Amino acid sequence: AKVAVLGASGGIGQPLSLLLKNSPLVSRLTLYDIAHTPGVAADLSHIETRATVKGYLGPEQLPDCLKGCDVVVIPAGVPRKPGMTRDDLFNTNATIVATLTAACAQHCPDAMICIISNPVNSTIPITAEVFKKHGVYNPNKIFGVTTLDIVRANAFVAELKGLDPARVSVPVIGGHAGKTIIPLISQCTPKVDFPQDQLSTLTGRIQEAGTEVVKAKAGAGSATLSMAYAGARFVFSLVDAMNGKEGVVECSFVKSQETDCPYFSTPLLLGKKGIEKNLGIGKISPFEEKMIAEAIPELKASIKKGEEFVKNM
Amino acid sequence: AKVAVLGASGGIGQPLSLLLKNSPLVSRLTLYDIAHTPGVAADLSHIETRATVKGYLGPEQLPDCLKGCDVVVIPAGVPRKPGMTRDDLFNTNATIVATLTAACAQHCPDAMICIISNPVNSTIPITAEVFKKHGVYNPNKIFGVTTLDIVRANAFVAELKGLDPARVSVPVIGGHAGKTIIPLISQCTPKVDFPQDQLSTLTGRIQEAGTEVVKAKAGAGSATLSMAYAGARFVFSLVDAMNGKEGVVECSFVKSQETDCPYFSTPLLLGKKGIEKNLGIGKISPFEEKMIAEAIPELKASIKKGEEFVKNM
Numbered sequence: 001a002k003v004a005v006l007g008a009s010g011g012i013g014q015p016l017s018l019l020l021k022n023s024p025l026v027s028r029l030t031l032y033d034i035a036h037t038p039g040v041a042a043d044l045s046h047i048e049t050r051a052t053v054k055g056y057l058g059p060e061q062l063p064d065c066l067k068g069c070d071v072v073v074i075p076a077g078v079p080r081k082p083g084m085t086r087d088d089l090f091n092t093n094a095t096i097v098a099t100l101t102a103a104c105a106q107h108c109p110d111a112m113i114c115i116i117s118n119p120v121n122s123t124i125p126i127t128a129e130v131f132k133k134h135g136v137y138n139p140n141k142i143f144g145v146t147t148l149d150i151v152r153a154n155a156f157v158a159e160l161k162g163l164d165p166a167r168v169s170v171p172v173i174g175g176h177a178g179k180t181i182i183p184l185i186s187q188c189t190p191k192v193d194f195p196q197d198q199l200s201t202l203t204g205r206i207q208e209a210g211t212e213v214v215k216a217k218a219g220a221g222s223a224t225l226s227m228a229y230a231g232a233r234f235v236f237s238l239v240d241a242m243n244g245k246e247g248v249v250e251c252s253f254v255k256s257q258e259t260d261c262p263y264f265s266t267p268l269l270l271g272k273k274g275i276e277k278n279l280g281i282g283k284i285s286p287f288e289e290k291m292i293a294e295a296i297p298e299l300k301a302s303i304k305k306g307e308e309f310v311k312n313m
Numbered sequence: 314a315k316v317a318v319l320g321a322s323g324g325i326g327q328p329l330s331l332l333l334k335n336s337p338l339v340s341r342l343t344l345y346d347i348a349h350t351p352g353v354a355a356d357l358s359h360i361e362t363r364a365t366v367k368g369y370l371g372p373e374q375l376p377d378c379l380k381g382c383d384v385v386v387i388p389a390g391v392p393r394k395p396g397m398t399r400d401d402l403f404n405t406n407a408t409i410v411a412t413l414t415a416a417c418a419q420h421c422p423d424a425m426i427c428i429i430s431n432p433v434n435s436t437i438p439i440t441a442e443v444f445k446k447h448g449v450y451n452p453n454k455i456f457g458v459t460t461l462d463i464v465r466a467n468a469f470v471a472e473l474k475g476l477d478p479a480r481v482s483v484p485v486i487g488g489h490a491g492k493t494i495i496p497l498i499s500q501c502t503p504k505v506d507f508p509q510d511q512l513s514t515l516t517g518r519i520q521e522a523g524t525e526v527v528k529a530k531a532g533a534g535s536a537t538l539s540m541a542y543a544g545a546r547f548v549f550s551l552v553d554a555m556n557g558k559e560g561v562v563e564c565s566f567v568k569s570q571e572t573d574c575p576y577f578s579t580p581l582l583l584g585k586k587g588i589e590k591n592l593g594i595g596k597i598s599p600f601e602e603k604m605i606a607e608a609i610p611e612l613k614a615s616i617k618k619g620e621e622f623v624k625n626m
Binding site: 014019021040043049152218220224225228 | 330331335356359360361362363461464529538541
């Protein structure tokens, strides 16, 4: 597949691009940033894998970065500092996302667009209204990558139950910010029973995991190496479903109908043209229910800010 | 295998730790550095793979990081700036390597020791002499990692001849600095015949590649992502050979008797206790035989610089 990374010199951008260069599913990797991209490209081109690597710098090199891309991954944005909410990043990142997605609507409207830029709960309504603004919007091909939450949920349930994390799969629905992260532990594979004490502790741990890494990192950035893994996992899932593999399911914050919310993350069946089928919420426990009901106000609020922004910029 | 990364918060260190975390061959990854290792370990522990991750900060915790390791990888060191040569990093990287390998000689003397720290040609002699001071030198378990020259030689020969890099394997011998990097294109699999001028410029490409990436990074460091890749590839070959995989062959700057030069990189059959058979140089062309001739003085100087450093401090 032909994959572009927009924001390739950043903290997420550089290990993500290595993971992509290493994959045999990638035939061409195009890297964009406003600084340092030639050095990152030169470094990566020395890896003995097939993917051709090309770096681009500055706005006038953006179109050539995007032409013919099947998949575009956007991790561009400033990372949080200890004490900030992800919502505190909106004013600075909304502008980056609006600018780079406009160019995607112009040069690769048919590509799968994967947004990592914080805050996802507002930057995917931004992306969708930019694409609508250029009359090229397709709800089935715009993804808010929430895979880090699923990868966290699986490593944490594995740790606790003594299971191999390769064997654990728990769906996380909602959005990606605090209370909007809803891990459906009732739906986990395998089973796992936990007393509700252990269960509310585990849930909060999954909701606050990014904040603990920002704290742990103490001003040196947020989760980069696990976000690169998670982001690469989402792209690999999308590319081999594009290659015809059946039954590839991944959760993502997407244009939705499943709730009163216009955007919502649920399990999605992926196909040759993006989402083949929205698998919805499924059979949830009463605990899981109430979490969704308390989350929707935060989500409504994060979505309208994103929409509002494009309706005045 | 239980792997320690000393210098884990650095440029090579964090993507190398990512690639080791992502391996099924790794069951425990302990990370060491003087700064930032807690946040790196928190980030990496969220990935859904098996290896358990623990970060260690400061000299007081170095023995804890090392106990029970099978493999120790030492990326620690300052990178070159444009204009600087690899020996300009000798005084700063020699003291780091001496400190860390004295801790390794005491706390995990039986582990495989993989040295990436620049300049390898002098840095492996230091480690040898530190291990000998502590009465625990085993020449078949100490490796100066030159795998990036083989990854680069493979990838350059593959694009030049339109081949698939995955199938190309060219031997690179000597050491890792300028004219000491001797690629043996006669021994490449497959055949890849070149005009001699094509051949000079190809050898030049491989010899000065490290400087090209330093120049291309314009101050932001040297090769980090492809060195992470190469460092990871060597560690995985060493673990498979340790686990019992037959016929694992890798080139490495090792204590040798192939030439009248004390340390030399040549192909190595690896086995359960480290190098099982030193494969030597093989059949060379005139051109390669002359490169060895004119590399031997530079190599002998680097080695004695390394040796005299520990016979003092």
